[PDB]
């Protein structure tokens, strides 16, 4: 129930309409990631860098296992039963993630029976297919580099240089890993970590993991870029140095009777000045209810807005009244820069501030003039079939709406300042004025 | 017309003055970027990874061509003519970018006649020089790695490992590419994308592109770091998998009668407490007009501020009056931390809070004492030729200004709180007080 004519008269030209869809109903898969490569074919001169690497990796990986042990010790069958006294302090999300962690333990135990086969892999991607119950994929972090670079060069260079190269490669891998798997990882129980962050244990190559696991479509890319594909660590091994990860693949469900409307801001004229309305540019409408949306966390495509979570936020009554027709309640801000948008196109109809930009009609060769009392000009083919604005010549359609658009004025809102220091100064000024008014009282 | 003496007395010590310059007048060049390497010299065992890579790349590249086709179909000669009904909804920037896209089409058509030569390049950087009209450079994404790693190893390792290595390299390249060229790219028509983001199709090596195209200076580095060097995609090929990019090189023009002034904040004493003024640290002056500037989007050098667009913003009247001498209108905030700056140097003169820091004069061996009624202390060589502040001993110059600086007091402003939750709480408190005052009314 937005009043588009008045909003356009105040400089808010309606844009495209998009659909609203959120992730739901995930399917699960399990993978094994090894953080130490197999160096059995250069073991003549690996030196002692492997022991130091193992010590550093054990120091990195111990706190994660310690954090998982808190929920693994206090969960059993009851159908999942938890001891709240032992856990002590938790959030609802942590408890749900602990339930999921308990659910994954049967498959983790099935996978853990192939430890000898896991420890002996010597390729970057290996399929373990002993039984259909535990058909799993193993990814090794630096196996390809060792297989294609260090091994063939063994007989050419002195292998002190080979040892130094291996040490440098391991240190670079650890430097990349520490951003994600270091002390920043305080709560590994949750399942909100994306597959892109998890892939840092495999060198940032999440494409290989996703291509080995499932399929790719346009909705797959939309899910990938909206941070909807996540994973959870369910088992850590401190002797063979590998982890087991459960990957979740959801689907996008469209929410019925809901849409998102975009508004394009255009500067307008008032009292020899240039102004821009301070109004939200994206509006969420659900069952004739108008609200805000935090769209910075969502993905905006040409036809829909995709989020991994509902991001609706409340709106004040004055803003809702301004959006429905009360233009005197819409705030505005002065323009002091020379770089602002000054016209827009909607449904083949042009909305332009012809005071500040030069408008003329190619059909008649005459200029298009705006009165100093008007905010904007609406131009369609009834008055000007083809308009030229600088270097662009554009043909126009017919406007749907009031025939007397340019003969009817609008009521203006109060000017505002949106700077943070200006916000503090305005708060102080209002408080001092209120104190003076109370002093009179 | 800033009152520097009073601002220094309130803790705002004047810093350096910088010039203001913006980009303008770009020149254009055209390059070709190939997203698929030439594997004709290992084609014995490329396997079938090339077909899968082609399918994935086609799925990635189709929407960009679909978005360009909207403007390519509805533009013709009129001197550029556009059909507004077919386009429907657009901004001014999109229309200008569409005009530029139409302008680049002649050179794109000239380049597209060398498709057979483009498809047969087998080096990372190739110059096509058939005629002077279409002297172009071709960059291939992974050609160097294939030429220097996989080909010489074809006779040493089993080439199943070679196939796996090629697959891993292609997947890593796609993982890097998807951040820039995925569904985040909603509007490829515009020309606001930087050369650094475009270089992700060449492995992030924008230095090679810029060195092959033009020259390098200090102004070149300043333009590069201010995000002024941009590019636009003008043609996509879905059969040979390459793109044509137009690169813009602007120049920096200095704006006359404009400068940017910096203020260094120093804590000051009042009523056994420590305070910091809440005032913008960068002020823009243009033709004796004072305004704010959003400097987070600009590049700050030692002598100038460089931006790719004008970033002037308005300022309230109370802040403007505070900056011109009305110190009673300048807000202040309490200091509760032990880590704040407590002195500064300006034109060889020291401004110090000697209540909270220990000041003494080396020339006479005596301490420098500040009264409890004073905010700061100004120290120059008329009173103390050489001052010691902890581990630093500094010789001082002569102060230019009032001889009775330390004998004249200042009027203080109202305290404020700048926390977001505190802002909400203050808003609620003021609203409740206003409601009570209206209830009395």
């Amino acid at each position: 129930i937005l009043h588009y004519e008045k909003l356009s008269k105040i400089g808010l030209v309606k844009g495209v309409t998009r659909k609203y869809k959120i992730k739901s109903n995930p399917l699960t898969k399990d993978i094994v990631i090894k953080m130490i490569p197999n160096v059995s074919n250069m073991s003549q001169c690996t030196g002692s860098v492997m022991e130091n690497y193992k010590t550093r990796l054990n120091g990195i990986l111990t706190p994660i296992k310690g954090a998982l042990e808190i929920y693994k010790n206090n969960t059993h069958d009851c159908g999942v039963c938890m001891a709240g006294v032992a856990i002590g302090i938790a959030t609802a999300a942590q408890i749900t993630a602990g339930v999921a962690l308990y659910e994954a333990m049967k498959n983790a135990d099935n996978i853990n029976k192939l430890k000898s086969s896991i420890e002996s892999t010597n390729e970057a991607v290996v399929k373990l297919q002993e039984t259909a119950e535990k058909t799993v994929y193993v990814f090794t972090a630096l196996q390809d580099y060792i297989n294609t670079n260090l091994v063939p060069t063994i007989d050419k260079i002195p292998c002190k240089q080979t040892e130094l190269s291996l040490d440098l490669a391991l240190s670079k891998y650890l430097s990349d890993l520490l951003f994600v798997f270091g002390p920043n990882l305080q709560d590994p129980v949750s399942n909100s970590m994306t597959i892109q962050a998890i892939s840092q244990a495999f060198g940032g190559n999440y494409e290989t993991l996703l291509r080995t696991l499932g399929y790719a479509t346009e909705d797959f890319d939309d899910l990938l870029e909206s941070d909807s594909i996540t994973g959870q660590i369910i088992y850590v091994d401190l002797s063979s140095y590998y982890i087991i990860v459960r990957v979740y693949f959801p689907i996008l469900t469209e929410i019925q009777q809901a849409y998102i409307q975009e508004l394009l801001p255009v500067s307008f004229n008032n009292d020899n000045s240039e102004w821009i309305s301070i109004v939200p540019n994206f509006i969420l409408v659900r069952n004739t209810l108008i609200s805000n949306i935090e769209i910075g966390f969502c993905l905006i495509t040409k036809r829909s807005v995709i989020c991994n979570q509902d991001y609706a936020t409340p709106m004040t009554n004055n803003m809702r009244e301004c959006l429905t027709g009360s233009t005197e309640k819409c705030p505005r801000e002065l323009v002091v820069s020379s770089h602002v948008p000054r016209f827009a196109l909607s449904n083949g109809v042009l909305f332009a501030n012809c005071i500040s930009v030069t408008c003329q009609c190619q059909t008649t060769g005459r200029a298009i003039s705006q009165s100093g009392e008007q905010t904007l000009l609406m131009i369609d083919n009834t008055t000007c079939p083809t308009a030229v604005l600088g270097n662009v010549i554009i043909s126009l359609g017919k406007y749907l709406g009031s025939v007397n658009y340019n003969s009817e004025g609008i009521a203006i809102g109060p000017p505002v300042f949106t700077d943070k220091v200006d916000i503090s100064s305005q708060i102080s000024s209002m408080n001092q004025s209120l104190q003076q008014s109370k002093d009179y009282i | 017309i800033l009152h520097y003496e009073k601002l220094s007395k309130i803790g705002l010590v004047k810093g350096v003055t910088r010039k203001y310059k913006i980009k303008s007048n770009p020149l254009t060049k055209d390059i070709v970027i190939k997203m698929i390497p030439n594997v004709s010299n290992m084609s014995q065992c490329t396997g079938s990874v090339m077909e899968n890579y082609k399918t994935r790349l086609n799925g990635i590249l189709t929407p960009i061509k679909g978005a360009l086709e909207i403007y390519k179909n509805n533009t013709h000669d009129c001197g550029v003519c556009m059909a507004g009904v077919a386009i429907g909804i657009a901004t001014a920037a999109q229309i200008t970018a569409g005009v530029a896209l139409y302008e680049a089409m002649k050179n794109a058509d000239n380049i597209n006649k060398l498709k057979s030569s483009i498809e047969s390049t087998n080096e990372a950087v190739v110059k096509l020089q058939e005629t002077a009209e279409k002297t172009v450079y071709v960059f291939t994404a992974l050609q160097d790695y294939i030429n220097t790693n996989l080909v010489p190893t074809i006779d040493k390792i089993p080439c199943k490992q070679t196939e796996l290595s090629l697959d891993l390299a292609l997947s890593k390249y796609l993982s890097d590419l998807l951040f820039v060229f995925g569904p985040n790219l909603q509007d490829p028509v515009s020309n606001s994308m930087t050369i650094q983001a475009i270089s992700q199709a060449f492995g992030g090596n924008y230095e090679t592109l810029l060195r092959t195209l033009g020259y390098a200076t200090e102004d070149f580095d300043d333009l590069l770091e201010s995000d002024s060097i941009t590019g636009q995609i003008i043609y996509v090929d879905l059969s040979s998998y390459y793109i044509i990019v137009r690169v813009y090189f602007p120049i920096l023009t200095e704006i006359q009668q404009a400068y940017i002034q910096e203020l260094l904040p120093v804590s000051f004493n009042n009523d056994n407490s420590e305070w910091i003024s809440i005032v913008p640290n960068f002020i823009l002056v243009r033709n004796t007009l004072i305004s704010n500037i959003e400097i987070g989007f600009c590049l700050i050098t030692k002598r100038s501020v460089i931006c790719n667009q004008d970033y002037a913003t308005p300022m309230t009247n109370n802040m403007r009056e505070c900056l011109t001498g009305s110190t009673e209108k300048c807000p202040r905030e309490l200091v509760v931390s032990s880590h704040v700056p407590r002195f500064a140097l300006s034109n060889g003169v020291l401004f110090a809070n000697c209540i909270s820091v220990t000041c003494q004069c080396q020339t006479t061996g005596r301490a420098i004492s500040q009264s409890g009624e004073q905010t700061l202390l100004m120290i120059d060589n008329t009173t103390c030729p050489t001052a010691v502040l902890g581990n630093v001993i500094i010789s001082l110059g002569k102060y230019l200004g009032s001889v009775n600086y330390n004998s004249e007091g200042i009027a203080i402003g109202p305290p404020v709180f700048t926390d977001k939750v505190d802002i909400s709480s203050q808003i609620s408190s003021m609203n409740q007080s206003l409601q009570q005052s209206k209830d009395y009314i």
Epitope: V336, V357, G372, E373, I410 | -
Partner: antibody
Framework: EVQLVESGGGLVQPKGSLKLSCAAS????????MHWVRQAPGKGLEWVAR??????????YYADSVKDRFTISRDDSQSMLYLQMNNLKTEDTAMYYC??????????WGQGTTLTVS | DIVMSQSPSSLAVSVGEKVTMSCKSS????????????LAWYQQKPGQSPKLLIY???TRESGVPDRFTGSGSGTDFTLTISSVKAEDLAVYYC?????????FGGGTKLEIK
């Protein structure tokens, strides 16, 4: 198309009063601001008074020499402009023009009417 | 208030000759945001009402012949006629419409030899 016709001028005694009228046609009257401009015999142009439209609350502006003696008004239904002048002096004998303001500059001018004070 | 001055007061030209007159303001007429100059040139023939010639700094009103050219910026503005005809016998005024009280210039009379 755009037409402005002035009327009501003539000869008056000193310290008198007189009202001038301006009839507008060919355009939408209630959209634009209006001006009065006078020219003394043989001298240059001088701005007198300005009235704005309904969207700006009919704000009025006057020159220094006629600030407390002249009154400018408009009637949107009849598309008429009026200038009521009291306490007329010998310095007010001039030709008066009804001016249509387009944009912020003076767009259209009328024929003008003659005031003589003697 | 901004004071407007014109030069010269009078000037005699021959048919086919190029002519130039100057207008000056005490303060800048350039707008901060849209970068436009709020200066206009008007022409008044003997026995006729004034007519608008240039409304921005250099933009010609419809119906004005091509030989009239306005130029300038800041506080200095110039009106130039490439080839004065016999019908250009008139008085030319420069006006600023930036702010109150919107004063006119003194005027420049053109004479034909």
């Amino acid at each position: 198309e755009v037409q402005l016709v002035e009327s009501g001028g003539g000869l008056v005694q000193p310290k008198g009063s007189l009202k001038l009228s301006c009839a507008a046609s060919g355009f939408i009257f209630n959209t634009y601001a209006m001006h009065w401009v006078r020219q003394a015999p043989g001298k240059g142009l001088e701005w007198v008074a300005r009235i704005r439209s309904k969207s700006s609350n009919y704000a009025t502006y006057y020159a220094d020499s006629v600030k407390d003696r002249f009154t400018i008004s408009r009637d949107d239904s009849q598309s008429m402009l009026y200038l009521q002048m009291n306490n007329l002096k010998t310095e007010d004998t001039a030709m008066y023009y009804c001016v249509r303001e387009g944009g912020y500059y003076f767009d259209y001018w009328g024929q003008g009417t003659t005031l003589t004070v003697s | 208030d901004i004071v407007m001055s014109q030069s010269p007061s009078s000037l005699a030209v021959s048919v086919g000759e190029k002519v130039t007159m100057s207008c000056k303001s005490s303060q800048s007429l350039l707008h901060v945001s849209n970068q436009k100059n709020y200066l206009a040139w008007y022409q008044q023939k003997p026995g006729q009402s004034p007519k608008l010639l240039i409304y921005w700094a250099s933009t010609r009103e419809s119906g004005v012949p091509d030989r009239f050219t306005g130029s300038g910026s800041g506080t200095d503005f110039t009106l130039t006629i490439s080839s004065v005809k016999a019908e250009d016998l008139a008085v030319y005024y420069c006006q600023q419409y930036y702010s109150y009280p919107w004063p006119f210039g003194g005027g420049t009379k053109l004479e034909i030899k």
